[PDB]
Amino acid sequence: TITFPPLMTGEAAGPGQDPFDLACQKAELGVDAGLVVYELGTDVLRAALVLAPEVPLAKAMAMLPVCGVGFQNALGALAPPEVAVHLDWNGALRINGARCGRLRIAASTDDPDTQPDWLVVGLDLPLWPEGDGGETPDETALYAEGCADVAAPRLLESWARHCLHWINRWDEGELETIHGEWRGLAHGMGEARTEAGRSGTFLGVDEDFGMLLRDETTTHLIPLTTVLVQ
């Protein structure tokens, strides 16, 4: 039994359905915020949250870092303390330095100025490595990294709970604290980076979590809207 906070609604994905796709489909059909679509296998955990923040898209993109912090907190509550989680700006997850899943984000609009009707954040997390020869960016899997005592259902519940904590704080105006939490977890800050066909040093982020990428002569601003799933 998967128990979510009050006013979150869990829905297991059925045949032909995957969580991120289904949550987006349901969101476009008018299903409200608070839906958590999930799909658990022995080798993978997928889940997706439907949100509706009443701000322009530019600002609603903070839901990605917010749910990343949620995930880091959720795994830290369940895993051995030596397991390090870092968050890539683009939503990729790293466990003990290795690519191990990702957070995805979609919304009802791609205009930075428009308030979206909906936004969905999806988690994909490998639990055991898939060795079938399917193309993957993942370099490890959760249970390969010392987290064998972490149950997938409990991790899902915990992600939902910690995401809700940070989303509520974001709503109460605590963006600055969120920025600080996220900066401490950010992968590769201060280091070389290629992004959106540009290269430089990942200097940090602006208030809307846009990447500041400094090359030899200029600083590029890459808005976080660029990672929206099209």
- Chain residues in the site for a copy of itself (CB under 8 A): 3, 5-9, 31-35, 51-54, 164, 167-168, 171
Q: Is 207 in the site for Ca ion (CB under 5 A)?
A: no
33 is in an annotated binding site: yes
Residue 180 interacting entry, from a copy of itself, Ca ion, none, C-beta within 5 to 8 Å by type = none
**Distances 39 to 7, 93, 152, 222, 228 between C-alpha atoms, Å:** 20, 19, 10, 32, 22
Of Ca ion, a copy of itself, none, which one sits near residue 149, judging by CB under 5 to 8 A according to partner kind? none
The residue type at 103? L
Residue 19 binding Ca ion, by CB under 5 A? no
What's the rounded Cα separation, in Å, for the pair 16 and 81?
Answer: 38
| Residue 18 partner contact from a copy of itself, Ca ion, none using kind-dependent CB cut-offs of 5 to 8 Å | Ca ion
Q: Is 39 annotated as a binding residue?
A: yes
For 190: left if phi > 0, alpha if psi spans -120 to 50, otherwise beta; the answer is left
Nearest-angstrom CA–CA distance, 26 and 82: 39
- For residue 116, the minimal CB distance to a copy of itself (Å) is 14
Shortest distance (Å) from residue 13 CB to Ca ion: 5
CB of 212 to a copy of itself, least distance (A): 28
| Interaction partner, residue 168 (Ca ion, a copy of itself, none; CB < 5-8 Å by kind) | a copy of itself
* Nearest alpha carbon to residue 222 among 29, 128, 88, 107: 88
| Residue 52 binding target from a copy of itself, Ca ion, none, CB below 5 to 8 Å by type | a copy of itself
Site for Ca ion in 21-60 (CB under 5 A): 32, 34
DSSP 41-102: -SSEEEEEEEE--SS-HHHHTTHHHHHHHHHHHHHHHHS-TT--EEE-TTSEEEETTEEEEE
Which residue is closest to Ca ion by CB?
A: 34
Q: How far is the CB of 34 from Ca ion (least distance, A)?
A: 3
Please say whether the beta carbons of 43 and 131 come within 8 A: no
To the question of whether residue 124 is assigned a binding role by annotation, the answer is no
State how far Cα 228 lies from the chain centre: 12
Interaction site with Ca ion (CB under 5 A):
13, 18, 32, 34
